[PDB]
Design a protein around this ligand. Structure first.
Ligand SMILES: *CCC(=O)N1CCC[C@@H]1c1nnc(-c2ccc(C(F)(F)F)cc2)s1
Lengths: 235, 235
């Protein structure tokens, strides 16, 4: 199967065909879902090759010395890693609707909001891995209020305005999994952030890439056990 | 003028039209990024220094993180995070572009900036700490080797070609303090990086913003004492 992840013993991929771009991804990784949301929203011709993050092949470290996902690779052999960098690269290098505003200040704002979100993925990961949960859930609420304050001052539904933009796709994957883990109580003190979650689920690009709550919980149970079959959950 | 505003200080008035304000600190390398870009692009600006140990009560309404640098234009728009401020200035103002508009090239410099992201954390540890100086020197050498490999693979003098660009200004402030921290032996095994440093010192913008050895010495001692006069060393 083409979606099955590549582990140790897999052959490194061949050259990227011209006119297309390759993304080294993982179907349950929020950092890579950022890039795939942009690829879907911009209708970019691309191919997906999943990396078994619990059985990483050694050749993948040549694509990215951090050994991390997502990674983009065009026909010229050029490689782009870091999730936010891959998204901005796709928004610039490809035609269609711009997910990033053309105004220098409004684009600086989305990057500033991204920085307000920077602490969440780390706290989110430590909470998944002793019952100190109460402290990590409180550290969630503290970071979530910072997002709530942005929506309060902007007086809009999305973080970039009344329409969905790049910053929404950068933030959404961690709140998509929040509902799948029955952790919606962590945003009952952030009503505008909670409304934003509901508005994101109405987006065609978002709902096309949504992972069911049973698929995420099944993957996460295998991933926390470091199972080599975690990244291929659901075939 | 250069004297830092502290607690109880009056908030500054509106920024005059055609100008921009930077909330800075004379010894902060993150703020020096923005000041290097302002000088390199010939942007008329005013500098307001903030006592980072005795921060003004109003400064938190300019940046929720209470951190420097911060840009404020005549429209009252606020831009923080050093990298964001540098990209904003290069887009919002005319003159010579410091950042390449090519999506891949700009993605590379951001990827190079990510490879550099460990050095600002290590510099703060060397300044703060003990006998971990020897261990921190090895980390500097290993991180600088990552930059040495970038300059070697590009076969160029600077990180963005054979002329000085934005990524050089973003990385320089930490290499400028290497001599005052008596860490020059950390670049003895990085010839391309040594040549890069010598070329940066010859840059007119870099030369005008250099800090004497005895000023960075006194500021560090006072910062190593939690002094409200550290930011205003030398007055
Ligand atoms: C690249 C893959 C990756 O980062 N991961 C795979 C499993 C661990 C890690 C995580 N990715 N998303 C995670 C997560 C956990 C909890 C939430 C929460 F919203 F809090 F419910 C969100 C996202 S761990």
């Amino acid at each position: 199967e083409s979606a099955r992840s590549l582990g140790k013993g897999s052959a490194p991929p061949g050259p990227v065909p011209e006119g297309s771009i390759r993304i080294y991804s993982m179907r349950f990784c929020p950092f890579a879902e950022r890039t795939r949301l942009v690829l879907k929203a911009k209708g970019i011709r691309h191919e997906v090759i999943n990396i078994n993050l619990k059985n990483k092949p050694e050749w993948f470290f040549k694509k990215n010395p951090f050994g991390l996902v997502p990674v983009l690779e065009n026909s010229q052999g050029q490689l782009i890693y870091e999730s936010a960098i891959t998204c901005e690269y796709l928004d610039e290098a490809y035609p269609g609707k711009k997910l990033l505003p053309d105004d220098p200040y409004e684009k600086a704002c989305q990057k500033m909001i991204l920085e307000l979100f920077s602490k969440v993925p780390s706290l989110v990961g430590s909470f998944i891995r002793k019952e100190d949960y109460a402290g990590l859930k409180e550290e969630f609420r503290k970071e979530f209020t910072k997002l709530e304050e942005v929506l309060t001052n902007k007086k809009t539904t999305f973080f970039g305005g009344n329409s969905i933009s790049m910053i929404d796709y950068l933030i959404w994957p961690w709140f998509e999994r929040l509902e799948a883990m029955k952790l919606n109580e962590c945003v009952d003190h952030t009503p505008k952030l909670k409304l934003w979650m509901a508005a994101m689920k109405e987006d065609p690009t978002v709902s096309a890439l949504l992972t069911s709550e049973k698929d995420w919980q099944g993957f996460l149970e295998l991933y926390l056990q470091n199972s080599p079959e975690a990244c291929d959950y659901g075939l």
